[PDB]
Amino acid sequence: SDPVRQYLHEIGQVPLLTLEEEVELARKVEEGMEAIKKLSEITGLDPDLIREVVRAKILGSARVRHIPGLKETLDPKTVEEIDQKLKSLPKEHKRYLHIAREGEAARQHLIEANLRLVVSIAKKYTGRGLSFLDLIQEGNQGLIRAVEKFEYKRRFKFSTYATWWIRQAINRAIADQARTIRIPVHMVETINKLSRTARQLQQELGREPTYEEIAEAMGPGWDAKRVEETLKIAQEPVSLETPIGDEKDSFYGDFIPDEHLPSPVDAATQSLLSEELEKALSKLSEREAMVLKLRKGLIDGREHTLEEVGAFFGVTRERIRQIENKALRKLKYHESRTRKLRDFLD
């Protein structure tokens, strides 16, 4: 029923490792990687392309997908094909295909074994924009990192080394998907700075600080202006469906006009202009009301300075610029009788 007690139960099935099984699995994973590029420079294929094939066969054909980064599409034909020039090796070279396979198999039991640890870390990064499970999965995600980077020979327990990548990966998710407006992980980092320093200022003053009382305690390069515009981008949006009233028959979104699409006044105001100016071109001359009807656009606009003006108008380059003045001139006298244009300047 409850999708957390569920996962809390699957986890509770894989037993916890003991010190030997810890170092056993860790050891096998290390050796198996070594095995994989020893296995690569023998056959000369590619460590990763080889690693995925070890990976497929251990987990079953249940899963295989063309892995981004590999150059060929890893379909079950190339996994039999390539598992073949693999098992084709001498017992002292194909020695290592058994090493890899053993490694991948220990990779798993070492991840699966240490999931209860992730839980006990994500548990305390709650209420930060991401849900428990979302946090767990991210936590897990880092755990995977931890095994491909563990060094059993340093003698540390596994808990210790992984508790780094785990929180390293929660914290990157809390800071990369929480906000509806994604803000670079470092800006997020400095924002939290203002928050925490403002908080101590308030705990010191007995009132919330001003902008400047922050720019000071924030140090140098920090002025009041720069704390302010940092806060307004820090600003999280709000729901169009937020409730307006204690009943629920109005949405905050309902009181919001649609500025984009033209209103019917405007819609109409545009069509009457763009023809009562066509009602001032065919009034004195329609080929001088056409070369300056092409010094801009009736639609699309056509206006540069001197270059296509010089290509196809019929006339020379600075003669179209003169009937440009007289086309305009005539309209400025033309538009002392049909004075139905002033209104359009608002």
Binding site: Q202, Q203, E204, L205, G206, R207
Partner: protein
């Protein structure tokens, strides 16, 4: 006062918690500069 469950640590500060809104004489409140009233609520009462 913080005290350590094991050593006997003693620190003592008075930490600012924020502002509580006060009630005027006529028995109302000013919240973002707008008088308001807190209507009593009737409910069933604790008991068996």
């Amino acid at each position: 006062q913080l005290i350590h469950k094991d050593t006997g640590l003693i620190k003592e500060d008075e930490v600012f918690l924020g502002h509580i809104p006060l009630m005027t004489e006529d028995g109302s409140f000013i919240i973002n500069g707008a008088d308001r009233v807190i209507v009593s609520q009737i409910h069933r009462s604790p008991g068996v």
